[PDB]
């Protein structure tokens, strides 16, 4: 870079802007961390609900397979549609979209809901509730992971700035200051030389 007073002022302004940006990014990171903790609490609640639903649904399945034959249970499960093509809505959060899972779940009067087995329908309802809890848990966890990614990105930006950008700008500032001071010192030396010449020519030769 060219060492000039204007360039030195520009570098000082760049340093001030970098410091202000570091502070701004730290504030943004604090807000992101608060949001992250809120989502962690909600994720803990959702995980506990999911575990309770898993317990009740597994108990219902075991009861159905004990009271009713496993083979007829498998046959009843065969007649259930795969219910594929679940909606994946993209939700904007903190500057980008993330997929949110909201199953329409158009079973309604699900095909072959009752028949030779009786307890199988109760286990099916329990497993549908379990699937709802699972999609809730996944919807929470994807947002939590995205928030963590944003926090990591902000931390990386802050570290990069305050470890390579600010020191480099400060080094450039000190180098430009040294060059300017050397130039003014040379100018002072030249002025002393010319003053000596003037006094020599004015005194010795009258």
């Amino acid at each position: 870079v060219s060492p000039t007073r204007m360039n030195l002022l520009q570098r000082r302004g760049q340093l001030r802007l970098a410091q202000k940006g570091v502070d701004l990014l730290k504030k943004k990171r604090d807000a992101l961390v608060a949001e992250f903790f809120g989502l962690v609490r909600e994720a803990m609640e959702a995980r506990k609900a999911l575990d309770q639903a898993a317990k009740e649904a597994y108990a219902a399945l075991l009861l159905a397979q004990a009271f009713d034959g496993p083979e007829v249970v498998a046959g009843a499960a065969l007649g259930v549609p795969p219910l594929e093509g679940v909606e994946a809505e993209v939700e904007n959060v903190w500057g980008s979209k993330v997929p949110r899972l909201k199953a329409t779940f158009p079973d309604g009067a699900l095909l072959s809901p009752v028949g030779t087995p009786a307890y199988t329908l109760e286990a099916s309802r329990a497993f549908r509730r379990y699937a709802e809890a699972l999609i809730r848990v996944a919807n929470t966890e994807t947002r939590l992971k995205k928030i963590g990614e944003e926090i990591k990105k902000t931390t990386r930006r802050v570290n990069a700035l305050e470890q390579v950008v600010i020191p480099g700008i400060r080094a450039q500032i000190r180098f430009i200051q040294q060059v300017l001071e050397q130039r003014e010192r040379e100018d002072t030396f030249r002025l002393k030389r010319i003053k000596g010449k003037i006094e020599a020519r004015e005194a010795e030769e009258e």
């Binding site: 962690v40 994720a43 803990m44 995980r47 506990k48 999911l50 575990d51 898993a54 317990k55 649904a57 597994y58 108990a59 399945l61 249970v73 498998a74 009843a76 499960a77 065969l78 259930v80 549609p81 795969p82 219910l83 594929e84 093509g85 679940v86 909606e87 994946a88 997929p99 899972l101 199953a103 779940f105 079973d107 699900l110 199988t120 286990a123 099916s124 497993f127 549908r128 379990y130 699937a131 699972l134 999609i135 848990v137 996944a138 966890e141 994807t142 939590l144 992971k145 963590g148 990614e149 926090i151 990591k152």
Partner: protein
């Protein structure tokens, strides 16, 4: 969606209306689920923690393409009754995504 935890949970989800593929295998289940991922008619794949503590190996092929599916641990046939460690799993996830061990 799909579940590949164990044949019990696979049958249960098949009853609920979510097809499952196979039993708990530490080797072939990864390839089976990746072949399942090769198509996109769903949004979720669920595995018990005992078979796969973290699906990071499977999702390493998804950040490049088709990030829509969600890979997450679930509770298996027995450990659900045993009691899943919600606090421990959440603490591990937080420590992984932040890099610091903090109280939740």
């Amino acid at each position: 969606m799909a579940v590949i935890a164990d044949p019990e949970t696979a049958q249960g989800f098949r009853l609920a209306g979510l097809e499952g593929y196979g039993a708990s295998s530490a080797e072939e289940a990864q390839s089976l689920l990746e072949t399942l991922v090769e198509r996109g008619g769903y949004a979720l794949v669920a595995v018990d923690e005992a078979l796969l503590p973290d699906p990071e190996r499977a999702v390493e092929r998804l950040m490049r393409g088709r990030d829509l599916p969600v890979l997450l641990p679930i509770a298996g046939l027995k450990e659900a009754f045993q009691g899943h460690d919600v606090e421990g799993y959440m603490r591990e996830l937080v420590r992984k995504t932040i890099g610091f061990d903090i109280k939740l």
